[PDB]
């Protein structure tokens, strides 16, 4: 193929240099370089250093202001937790492994790390979706009047978890597998080969459709509606200067929000699709590290967008930082 098949590893670089072995037993330096590992380790360290404070604050501010615990805030707390799963499941592991230049926790480790990373990222993914949904229901008013309560919020949180498990759990029971991605120091889901006996082919189609295309449609729908609604609102309220500012502001914000979903998951989808359509196109594993960089950084930019850029949260945080 365009990689190297194994029983629990899939190096996305073809064996033709006669040095491609298991990436759990051989140090990678025949498809990577020591400097690239230093940069990898640096990048993961950064993401921990930024990601942990940002997500800690999101949880923290809610605990000290009673009134912030509302139906619409469940999902925000959930987002912060999701991101932290990615930090301690993914980032820390990848930081450790990178300095050996290969994944040193073995096949079982790969399944563990891959589970926590996938779980994290998927709860995050679906969090962004649910958040957009809640915003769509409240603002765009698509169907006749319905109340939104705590119980519904909790169901929403559980639902994102279920969808995440629906992706992270299959490779543990042999419907696909976790195998090294990137510079072979992080484990993702295999998607670089079709392989019926391990069910890789069917899974890749499932992943691309259910976990990218479906989300992508929902994101576009919700935010499209939101901009439409706000423009309309502004037209009905041109006697208020504020609303005119708001329409421009909403358009700016929506662009940032849409872009943030795109950057995170489009690389994975794009690469996966290209390999599927043109099976036999070999590229280096450094190409495969590019999607991971973008995805992992969402642990920083998602809470910045969805928490920090809310007026209320800002005020409360400022109060707390200035000794209150």
């Amino acid at each position: 193929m365009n990689g190297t098949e194994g029983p629990n590893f899939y190096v996305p670089f073809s064996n033709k240099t006669g040095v491609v072995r298991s990436p759990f037993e051989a140090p990678q330096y025949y498809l990577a370089e020591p400097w690239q590992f230093s940069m990898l380790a640096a990048y993961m360290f950064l993401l921990i250093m930024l990601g942990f404070p940002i997500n800690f604050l999101t949880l923290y501010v809610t605990v000290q202001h009673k009134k912030l615990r509302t139906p619409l805030n469940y999902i925000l707390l959930n987002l912060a937790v999701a991101d932290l799963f990615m930090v301690f499941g993914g980032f820390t592991t990848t930081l450790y492994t990178s300095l050996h230049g290969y994944f040193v926790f073995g096949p079982t480790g790969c399944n563990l790390e891959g589970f926590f990373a996938t779980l994290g990222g998927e709860i995050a993914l679906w969090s962004l979706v649910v958040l957009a949904i809640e915003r769509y229901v409240v603002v765009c008013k698509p169907m006749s009047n319905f109340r939104f309560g705590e119980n519904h919020a909790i169901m929403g949180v559980a639902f994102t978890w279920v969808m995440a498990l629906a992706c992270a759990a299959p490779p543990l029971v042999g419907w696909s597998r976790y195998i090294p991605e990137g510079m072979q120091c992080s484990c993702g889901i295999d998607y670089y080969t079709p392989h019926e006996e391990t069910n890789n082919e069917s899974f890749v189609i499932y992943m691309f459709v259910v976990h990218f295309i479906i989300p992508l449609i929902v994101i576009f729908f919700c935010y499209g509606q939101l901009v439409f609604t706000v423009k309309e609102a502004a037209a009905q309220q041109q006697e208020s200067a504020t609303t005119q500012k708001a329409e421009k502001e909403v358009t700016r914000m929506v662009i940032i929000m849409v872009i943030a979903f795109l950057i995170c998951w489009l690389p994975y989808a794009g690469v996966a699709f290209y390999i599927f359509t043109h099976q036999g196109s070999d590229f280096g594993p450094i190409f495969m590290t590019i999607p991971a960089f973008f995805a992992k950084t969402s642990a920083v930019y998602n809470p910045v967008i969805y928490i920090m850029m809310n007026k209320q949260f800002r005020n409360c945080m400022v109060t707390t930082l200035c000794c209150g």
Binding site: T70, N151, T229, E232, A233, M253, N310
Partner: protein, 346 residues
């Protein structure tokens, strides 16, 4: 913003509007954190009309043990309706909070409206204040005629509608006395809007409501409390000392008639406190302050203020001007609590 987006959604509904079931009202941003739970804007499924819903959260209720206070507010507001007192439209419960859905007053509340005219405008101009005072007086009179002592009144509980007709609101710190006792003792109302008698746990009549009127009017014109400066509220013991001892100073913003009127209400001797001396609520109305007012025209809604809030732009505090209060600290509901919640629901 996001807070602006939430405000924008409210605006969106309003724009369309201008042009039960407990899962039957579309929820927007909160307008404040009320006495107990939140008080948020909300919308009718069947008519597409905006209401405020004062929610009294089950958690916060358990914490203060505020079950008696809730039931009182229900029964009083449910019975009392006029043209200078707000109506109650629904009382239902969810599984998380008890709901009061009350009638339109989309012009914001007087406390807001002090700052919405301009934040650097301290209170209202004298004619504008006189109009609102007259309307408040009619509301107080109506309560007193049904033998109800309010024990409170404050700017934030005087709401404006879009035409600038005001009504008093909230009768949850009130008591309806029967014909047989003309006085009662107790501690009720919001501190710094409570008369000497209340703080000392002594007997009192309708006089205390007129003390509260004085405090309200003083703040209405000068944009600060009589017993503390604006954006303050000292501890209960000190505040109590202020109410009992401190002779209020009167700016030259006032006319002589308004100075004199304020002095009469902020008197700490109820016998000398104008309002119900000689059992007349119409004796108060004879004061020179009410020169501009004719009672017949007031009652017919033919008197309007100079500043009238817009009828297409909503007014009230946002979701970042809010307060907060203790929801449960690990304290799970008892059977007793559940039985009260069921009993409350009509």
């Amino acid at each position: 913003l996001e807070t602006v987006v939430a405000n924008s959604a409210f605006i969106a509904a309003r724009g369309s509007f201008d042009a039960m079931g407990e899962d039957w009202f579309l929820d927007f941003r909160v307008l404040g954190r009320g006495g107990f739970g939140e008080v948020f804007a909300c919308q009718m499924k069947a008519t597409g009309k905006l209401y405020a819903c004062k929610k009294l959260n089950k958690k916060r209720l358990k914490k203060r043990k505020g079950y008696q206070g809730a039931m009182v507010e229900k029964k009083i507001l449910a019975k009392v309706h006029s043209r200078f007192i707000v109506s109650l439209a629904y009382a239902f419960e969810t599984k998380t909070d008890l709901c009061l859905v009350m009638t339109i007053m989309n012009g914001g509340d007087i406390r807001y409206h002090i700052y919405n005219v301009d934040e650097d405008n301290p209170g209202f101009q004298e004619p504008r204040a006189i109009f609102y005072t007259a309307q408040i007086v009619s509301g107080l009179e109506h309560l007193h005629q049904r033998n109800i002592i309010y024990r409170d009144l404050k700017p934030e509980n005087v709401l404006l509608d879009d035409d600038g007709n005001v009504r008093i609101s909230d009768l949850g710190l009130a008591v309806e006395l029967k014909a047989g006792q003309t006085k009662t003792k107790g501690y009720a109302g919001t501190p710094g809007f409570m008369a000497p008698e209340l703080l000392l746990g002594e007997e009192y009549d309708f006089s205390v409501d007129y003390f509260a009127l004085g405090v309200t009017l003083y703040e209405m014109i000068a944009a600060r409390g009589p017993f503390r400066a604006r954006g303050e509220k000292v501890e209960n013991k000190e505040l109590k000392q202020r109410v009992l001892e401190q002779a209020v100073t009167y700016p030259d913003k006032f006319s002589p008639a308004s100075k004199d009127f304020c002095e009469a209400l902020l008197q700490k001797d109820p016998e000398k406190r104008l309002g119900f001396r000689d059992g007349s609520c119409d004796g108060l109305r004879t004061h020179p302050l009410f020169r501009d007012i004719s009672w017949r025209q007031l009652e017919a809604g033919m008197l309007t203020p100079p500043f009238v809030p817009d009828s297409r732009t909503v007014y009230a505090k946002n979701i970042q001007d809010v307060g907060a209060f203790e929801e449960v600290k690990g304290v799970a509901f008892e059977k007793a609590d559940t039985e009260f919640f069921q009993e409350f629901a009509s």
